[model samples]
Target: TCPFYKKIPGTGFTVDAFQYGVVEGCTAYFLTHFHSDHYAGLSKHFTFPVYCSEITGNLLKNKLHVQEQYIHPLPLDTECIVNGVKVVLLDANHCPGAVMILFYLPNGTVILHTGDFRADPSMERSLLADQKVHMLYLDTTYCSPEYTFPSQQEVIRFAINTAFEAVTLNPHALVVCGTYSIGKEKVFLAIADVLGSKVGMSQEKYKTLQCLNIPEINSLITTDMCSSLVHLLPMMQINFKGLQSHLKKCGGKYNQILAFRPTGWTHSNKFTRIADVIPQTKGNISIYGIPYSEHSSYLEMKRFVQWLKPQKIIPTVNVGTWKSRSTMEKYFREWKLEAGY
Candidate 1:
């Protein structure tokens, strides 16, 4: 259950707290993105007014069958008042429709809730940097020192080049990329662009992408699985058995497969061979576990904290234990000191 998800003190609202049945003192519900982890517990029957981005609202209605009257679509970079609280949506740089919520409470307290995001240098220019945040709810998925992975651009280029080389060796080889509902679309989309081939994915995934309205996405997507050499699949289907079964489903159109499991968890280890260096191969199938993350790295998180210098930080992840939360707080203490607080 969402033990870490707590109500903002003194505010009659909750952020990403859908699992709870009729939260006490809650009048409005806010969603940061469409990810399942955050949107868990949400159902079509739930009775609450949800405030989120337009894209997220669309997904909730079309994919989840949520009622339209309860969905409130907010535009980014604009200030709007909800139940006497000044709220604004900012780009999260993690995925489509993901936003960082900035709230100015009635009691003059400021709160910044980063639902989940990757640190981008341009974020420093946001109006959030100009104000003193009273409380900061951070995405602490990789808050430790050992989770420093490469930037998104670096990982994307690496995956594209590697796929190019593999396809060069065997043009008949199928390139399979593991992705979630909304995120990780960039990786497989980039591969299709460089290789000049269409992408094959489930109709459900194709419809989800249509909601984002990505430029030329419809042109790059195809329903004919056999025609496209590159295929986008759910994360669970990246394994050997899943890939083999998928190939067989396509009438054994391809002889070999080059699969990519793009995630941040795979790169936390310092001892293992880096994804950019080599891939694990077995039989005719090769798997590359690249460091492709939507969350901030340790260095990025530190730099973001120092640059913002919030008064208080409440971690959103890895907070189940007092020791785990305390360990993460140590870095924040050092970060504040480095910022000359």
Candidate 2:
């Protein structure tokens, strides 16, 4: 088998390069985001110079600990030649290091890969102006009417306000919020900023934030210095049972215990379990299910497709699965296009 058989199709080839024979041609690879689903197979199997935005490069190298030799970091809106192919990286508002790519061929074919973007009105005028996109390989992850998301600012506000309310309800409570090490750093910072405290960062995340020159969101505490918080500790782990055990041990001394899941509240049924657990707690252990996410919502996806107005739109990411296809078809119908794998 291939050294990295991460994709669903599973590369059905031997690991030995000699067995595979030498490949003659060159293909330019573009990485849109550092998320595992998009980039898990890249470093193991591909060695050609891969193009990405400077922020994404910094995140992959400094935070994700990807090797520098494999990345070609280009600034936003800057076009560069890789294997004689013209490529451009545009700002993807999904996350801090996210980006969309535009590949231009000499024969006048322009391909736009919309790598997980949302409709941030502030970013629209600049992104559309800089790149003249033709055919869009869109991210239709939430292309159905049922999927809705709260704005980034709204989620941030809710998280901060909820934390404050929890603390007020119980004076001596230890609060721990869980998030991805990279994208949710901002959410943590926003909470700390409002509380006049600093949220701690994982070592990997701190290195990346430092590399990107992100200003200190608060003077309260670094991820390394979380012992000082005594009441609030921001964690990056995903295990709910482990978090609960730690919280239980610390509960007697503290009046409140609060934590947030990184995923959007309505994204999955598991979150419903998390929500249920919170209401059952005694002595005010509040879990707030704020609707924050890195992916584009149904409305945002609709707007983006409308703007591009492409002859054909191919949905990637969460499409093609048997259970999800009908929902995807509904979206394609709304756009007046045929939907099929």
Candidate 3:
């Protein structure tokens, strides 16, 4: 059985990743972001134009090296027609160029594909607020009561303030922040804006960030280490082993290294979304998971479904932590009634 997508009966289109073989007949394609997992195995020669945000289109053209003829960039929050289908792209608030796609069908059906999005109050004022969503392709990464954390902005404030304090306490120490190649770019630029230091990236990542040509990030992106006290690195690089190895090259240069991992996992299993613990220190490195996630928390996801009141609930992830439609149906109905839906 195919799991990459669930079609909208008469819409004649598909959402998110291209699910092998099942969707060959569908005309036109829409991508939510540029993450490898989402766009994995894309055919280099596949000429069908894929619609996405401008920055995501840039990644496809410049980074992924896809042909621009096959990459159509849609302005965010603006209405457009793909073939005969009506569509709009909304800022997912997950990463710099990430988005949530809204599909308005000819049959008067509204569908939302939340590739990976955190609920922002701003969405309520958008065009989708008053619409009835017939189907929802959800990102249920943290779909349990145990997965609560603070907002990304709050966590970013924590990350910036704490990392600076660590470096301030010991100017000899280096402040390292963990992030994905594309996600959490705001954190990267934000740290640079506040600290007044060039955020260094490995030459490989610099190639992509430079092409983005964003004024906020210009000059902040660098390849040289041992040059700046504040450093931005990949998630894996901030770990004990990764840092230890790098420290070997620059350890004598700094007194201590403080790290922050922007993940929802830093929160304890028992708390709700509002209540959270700050960064936990561990042996010279103070690290915390900034709730700087693109995916919705359990409570937010539930509220989104309740508010939309969709006719169908389709979970995008059904391969590894597979949850069936029937199971989700029951969960939604019971949870909604209890939640005052």
Query: Local distance difference test, per candidate?
Result: 0.85, 0.58, 0.72
| Candidate 1 TM-score, true structure as reference | 0.94
Question: For candidate 3, lDDT tens digit of each residue in 224-294?
Answer: 86787667677777777777666666547875777767655434534444455465666665666566676
Task: Please estimate how well model 3 matches the true structure, expressed as its whole-model Cα lDDT.
Answer: 0.72
The residue-by-residue lDDT of candidate 2 on 99-119, one tens digit each, is: 876667566667666777775
Q: On residues 37-134, what C-alpha lDDT tens digit does candidate 1 reach at each position?
A: 88887878977899999999989998888899899999999999888788999989888999999988888888989999997778898888777888
Looking at model 1, the pairs that clash are none
Report the Cα lDDT for candidate 1: 0.85
Error of 1 at 245 (Å): 2.3
Task: Flag the better candidate by TM-score, 1 or 2.
Answer: 1
TM-scores for every candidate against the unseen true structure: 0.94, 0.77, 0.87
Question: Which of the two, 2 or 3, has more lDDT?
Answer: 3
